[PDB]
Design a protein around this ligand. Structure first.
Ligand code: O9R
Ligand code: O9R
Ligand code: FBP
Ligand code: FBP
Ligand code: FBP
Ligand code: FBP
Ligand code: OXL
Ligand code: OXL
Ligand code: OXL
Ligand code: OXL
Ligand code: K
Ligand code: K
Ligand code: K
Ligand code: K
Ligand code: MG
Ligand code: MG
Ligand code: MG
Ligand code: MG
Lengths: 422, 425, 425, 436
């Protein structure tokens, strides 16, 4: 029965053709949904009660579109998101962190506009986790956004939006200096021929997967759901194909910001992503990611590949990782394990930001410290297990891979352990 | 010999990649498609696309198959639609550069437990009006196909039956349905109501894979460019859907309300044409051909053996085309199953086979009507040169190009056993 | 039949990994195919008798090597005459006649920088006596090959030059030597003295791989069955060495003292024949063909394009043979480079080409002696039928087998362009 | 280039020219062959063990010391010749030569003692002489038994029964010497600790031209099972009378190592030949060259794909450690082992990194020579009061011996494999450590 669920017969196939032939509509997904959902906040999704329903439906990142509304409007949106998120903090083992992302207006006819400098400063002052930088055309555009965030905003992630021919052509230099990329298909589909957008999307997703950096697929994914309760056949296909391409995040714009069915749009993306993740051909995917990733003398990099290899060998239910900045969880995520990467962190910001990496489930550790560091480590590992059992990731008898470091502080991950649950 | 510019077009750097990941990374928006569009476009005929003048524009835009939806309209209405399609098609008989055969497909209303009374009458109408294809609605088991086959009476056994998979039972009994059908249509509209909407992509990808493995045509249908019923440009999800259906391995892509009742039927055909061309160049032939090769069982049928040898030869020299002589379309279909990058120019004396080969990806039919030569080998050479001269006229070929020529050792269907490498003079 | 798929290591050949392939090797799986790796026997006092040479031809000797390091021109002329007398004693039965090449192995440069004066005299002797191949000793650079070519003069243009790599400089300048040579010999005797003995296997495997990639013949030579000079059976290391040279990809295997001066020259040839047959069935064609196909560059040469198409077609139907008409042996060589499992039966009128094609693995030469038919297409058909009748007589073919037939569109060398699937009747 | 560029800048182009690294990074087996370089020197320690047969030519304590220095890892006693008194003196001479180097524990080399039985002869099962010889082996503390002419699983059960309750730790390596042994191979391997391809008798029992098929098949199946396989007989035969081997003999040794043999053997070459030490030196030289020429890229992928999924933490830690070692070009994998099992599970994935096995068991240290790439270190220190400190001391002993023998240098990365509690069967931890 275990080997009939989550497309396991299709995953064991020797060729991609055989894998496609073995896909079964009756094979139910069992793993937790790995691809994060970014929902744009607007009139249709601004109330605290509506936001609680969207968090329950699967929203992981709240997007504020600074192309519309005043700073006062966005500050109220941020406050409503935080109020809805903290209404579930009473149960720490099931609490779900939600990242706040600021999408800039852009340069327009102009480098960095004066409105963008003011909006970026607003973001730092209001503690946003991510910036979706509009119309990035070169590496210097990223440096300008980084400078406008100042010294108080060093920790904010910059996701560069590729929206035109120049951004596509200078992609490598942009990715090198960015934390991740957004395939902004709306403007891209106007700037380049509409029939070429799929080539740009597939290329950028592939290069981001190669680099181990987050990639977001955005715009018109479930467009008809702005007015209709069910999407079209092309829309469900689009969401499934973005997940199959290798997108870490999928986004909703008007579907959540102004549409009549914002919660239903989030539920639909959740349902499709789960089905598409089970249909991923891990046999060739892991081999290609493994082969393409360069040799490394960094112990976090070395422990990550060893842990993902160990997880596949035993069909581990999860990889529990201790992370300060989210980096150790990101290096596990780049190898696309089938096992959930449960990231136990004390940093509330890192817990929100790791939603950018596919298959990373953040757990914000709010338990008292232990005097002995070794006891403190084991306690964070046990917290990971208890929250995993509560959320359905783990059961007694399961095997897990535990990834820790040899000394406190970020940058010292070097240990992988095989642990039997209970 | 060919130049650096040649190897930068039609995603050739991405096609030469050693891994699928590298192939994706090398896809270039500046790499222009050069080959002719190989995925056929099926357009549904209705009030928005019924006039002879409108049909001429749709033929010019790229329509290869005209679909008549028997769920609406009378026999008199559909007979007028058929006559208008044939009039628009025959208006280009004077120009060899513009003439293109167009298949006529009858989509049945559907079942009740088995074949309905109206379906029996509509199938009979199809035989009487010389339709080429039947899109059989709600096929659930092999006996449903046998009923449609029996209804195609004594005169209609040459009509192709494309079974529409629209429900859970059709998906579950897929192998037995495909075995007795000529091809499959992934009818996503009803399938998306019968099974959870989020599972349709699994059924589509599975059916396309199994049809590619069997070497039988597969059509992807419904809501591909839905928003173009009222808007002049499609959404980002719609262009993605068309591209992904072509990348999945669909032989045909379809337009329903977009052409039957929408405000932009010609623009919807142009959009599918443009996306299919881009997606065909992005196909990863290196692994695709190896997997089609490995999955296909060993064969002692000379047509099947010649076809794989010809596709291998075409890839080795970057052949501009594979010219094949075919009476039933079978030789062109067996070439098409290996997904060559070279166009398969099928020269035939059968008008029906010329229309029906539009079901197979990459087959470009040429109807030959010259009186037969007394010496058979001269008749063969005349048809081979007809294919070369038409290929030059349409832009597929130039002097100095290499073509692969597929023929048999004696006249009559079923004896293909020869593959020649010819230099265009 | 099930019995067919149990023989010639077919279960091991169908394996998905090389590890599974090794695990499926069966000592009870008997080889069925004809032995494809040629045996070169060095001629000497133990193998000069016309009666002894007839037994060696029957045992499997394909090339007779004359070592010009020993004996006078008078001695070698008598060796040539004895070989030709033994070879021609079987010419009364043209369907079973076996051509035998004569190769001249030069003395070498010695302490000198380039071509010695004795080598110039020996090379002219070879041209005057009609030798087919030259095994050029101690080739260190491309200019050494050019000097051998110049010493053969205008009359020795058709002689094949196989460069012997016997020292560190030859290994280091391998690419430039292979580019100008017709093939290579891994001369392990001197190589094992010039470089550390424990590194010879790396040089052998490297040179065989590069020759396989270039599609040029490679010979593995020296001490393969050394103990058989005095003992009737070889050691376990010796049989392993022969099997591994064949598995590495050697086109030819050689006997030196074993045939020139030993007590068991016929048995040494029989032993190499027996081992080579077993090792050829154990070749993992699934990965080998895929890698040869992938590594070979794209080509606009019709012989090159037809060869890959014909090898692909032969694998698709498990063809018993590929019958090829050739004037210079080039069409058979281009088939051979893809390492088909099917025997390459080469029909030629050139007695020299028939002898020289023994350098290419899996090429079985048939010398056609009939004067031409007035109609060229009938002359082509008669030769193809001669190929089939010889194949049936020798055990390569049976009624019901499938064969691939490779021919050209006009007479003369260089115009091969047709591949045909034929059923044996 | 991009997948090795940063590591090439760090370790240097000279690092990536040695030990056939350009050939190992090739995308196809054809390219791998084309890139083999005679100028690419082997850097790693020799990982295929050498078994030398002891006889009149190699019996003296002084001769045995030279053979230990030349590379002998296992001493074979052929019970087809000589009395129990003769073999007891051979055992005593081997132990005396081995212990003459015990003064330096960081460089001491353990040597296993193997008893090769006479066989059943005309009989159906275990002979009476075999029962007496097997009892002699237990009484004299032999580490391994090479059981002659094993034809079915019941033959190995009989050998195990004849070893009694005191010989439970002795490894049984079944010799496949005839058609029946080849045909019933799977049932024999299942109950044996390993296999020996006994080519001498096999080459008489089956056609000589088919022995290579049996050798390659058995080596492949043993590699798949993760059990030791020995290639034996006539490997360097001409060295019985000549100082240098033939071209076929060096080729045979190299091909046995390339096939996947854990051990290579010398019979008459050491037992009665004129050049026993030179024969050991030649096998050492060839094995080093052949190990560097192994195509790890496809080999590791095939061993991973063929090995079934496992819920055993030792099994899971071993594959994770070998994957980690390949990612950073680790100089070694240091493993703590009681029975040798954890080192054996690392060895089955054929890492390029040396598997330095630290053990307190003198028998396990001798027996791990059966597994390719396992370098045993016998730890003689008394236990620390705190178990975690005792573990750390053992790991440091592995690093210090590794630096002393040339396996490790400051700046190298090492993979350390340990367990969570004392006793055999609890290996579950993999650590990446930088050598200081
Ligand atoms: O899982 S993968 O290894 N799939 C590789 C893959 C994909 C396409 C092709 S193919 O050669 O395009 C092809 C298409 C149809 C039938 C065929 O026989 C072959 C061959 C191999 C993969 C590798 C990547 O690097 C990537 O970014 C995405 C995916 C992927 C994952 C799951 C899917 O369902 C599809 C693609
Ligand atoms: O080293 S390997 O990865 N090589 C695999 C391998 C071996 C042979 C072939 S092959 O297809 O026979 C080939 C391809 C190209 C050129 C040739 O001359 C031969 C393809 C791939 C290997 C993989 C295994 O899983 C294994 O158990 C053993 C060996 C191996 C051992 C000894 C050899 O001589 C060769 C390979
Ligand atoms: O993922 P990051 O940011 O590198 O953090 C991983 C770190 O977490 C730890 O496991 C625990 O460290 P802390 O005690 O500081 O929380 C470290 O040993 C390791 O370096
Ligand atoms: O594709 P089909 O229907 O099998 O037709 C292929 C047939 O066409 C030919 O190439 C030419 O035949 P005709 O001259 O009868 O048209 C035959 O040799 C071959 O058998
Ligand atoms: O392999 P080669 O030397 O190029 O010979 C191939 C030639 O043999 C043929 O098949 C037969 O030609 P001939 O009639 O001259 O023998 C030609 O069509 C072809 O060009
Ligand atoms: O390889 P084996 O025989 O299973 O031994 C591995 C064992 O060695 C250890 O690392 C250390 O154990 P000891 O302290 O008993 O020597 C254990 O944690 C582990 O179970
Ligand atoms: O800004 C965006 O997200 C776009 O243009 O698609
Ligand atoms: O009938 C159709 O085409 C459907 O249901 O999708
Ligand atoms: O010359 C040779 O044949 C040799 O040196 O091996
Ligand atoms: O007994 C043996 O060792 C043999 O036959 O090789
Ligand atoms: K914006
Ligand atoms: K209908
Ligand atoms: K010579
Ligand atoms: K014995
Ligand atoms: Mg935009
Ligand atoms: Mg329907
Ligand atoms: Mg020499
Ligand atoms: Mg024996």
């Amino acid at each position: 029965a275990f080997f009939q669920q989550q497309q396991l017969p299709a995953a064991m196939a020797d060729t991609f053709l055989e894998h496609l032939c073995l896909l079964d509509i009756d094979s139910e997904p069992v793993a937790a949904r790995s691809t994060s959902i970014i929902a744009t906040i607007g009139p249709a999704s601004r109330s605290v009660e509506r936001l609680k329903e969207m968090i329950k439906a699967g929203m992981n990142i709240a997007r504020l579109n600074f192309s519309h509304g005043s700073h006062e409007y966005h500050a109220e949106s941020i406050a409503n998101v935080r109020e809805a998120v903290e209404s579930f903090a009473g149960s720490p083992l099931s609490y779900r962190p939600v990242a706040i992302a600021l999408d800039t207006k852009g340069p327009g006819s102009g480098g960095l506009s004066e409105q963008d400098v003011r909006d970026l400063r607003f973001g730092v002052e209001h503690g946003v986790d991510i910036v979706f930088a509009s119309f990035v055309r070169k590496a210097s555009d990223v440096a300008a956004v980084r400078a406008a965030l100042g010294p108080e905003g060093h920790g904010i992630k910059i996701i560069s939006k590729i929206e035109n021919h120049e951004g596509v052509k200078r992609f490598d230099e942009i990715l090198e200096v960015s934390d991740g990329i957004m395939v902004a298909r709306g403007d891209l589909g106007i700037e380049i021929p509409a029939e070429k957008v799929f080539l740009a999307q597939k290329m950028m997703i592939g290069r981001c997967n190669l680099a181990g950096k987050p990639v977001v697929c955005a715009t018109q994914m479930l467009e008809s759901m702005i007015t209709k309760p069910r999407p079209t056949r092309a829309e469900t296909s689009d969401v499934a194909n973005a997940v199959l391409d290798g997108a870490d995040c999928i986004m909703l714009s008007g579907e959540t910001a102004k549409g009549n069915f914002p919660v239903e749009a989030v539920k639909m993306q959740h349902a499709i992503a789960r089905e598409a993740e089970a249909a991923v051909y891990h046999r060739q995917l892991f081999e290609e990611l493994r082969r393409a990733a360069p040799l490394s003398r960094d112990p976090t990099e070395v422990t990550a590949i060893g842990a993902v290899e160990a997880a596949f060998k035993c069909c581990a239910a999860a990889i529990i990782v201790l992370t300060t900045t989210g980096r150790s969880a990101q290096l596990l995520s780049r190898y696309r394990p089938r096992a959930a990467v449960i990231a136990v962190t004390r940093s509330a910001q890192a817990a929100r930001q790791v939603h950018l990496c596919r298959g990373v489930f953040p757990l914000l550790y709010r338990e008292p410290p232990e005097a002995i560091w070794a006891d403190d480590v084991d306690r964070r590992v046990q917290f990971g297990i208890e929250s995993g059992k509560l959320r359905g990731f783990l059961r007694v008898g399961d095997l897990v891979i535990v990834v820790t470091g040899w000394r406190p502080g970020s940058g010292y991950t070097n240990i992988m352990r095989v642990l039997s649950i209970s």
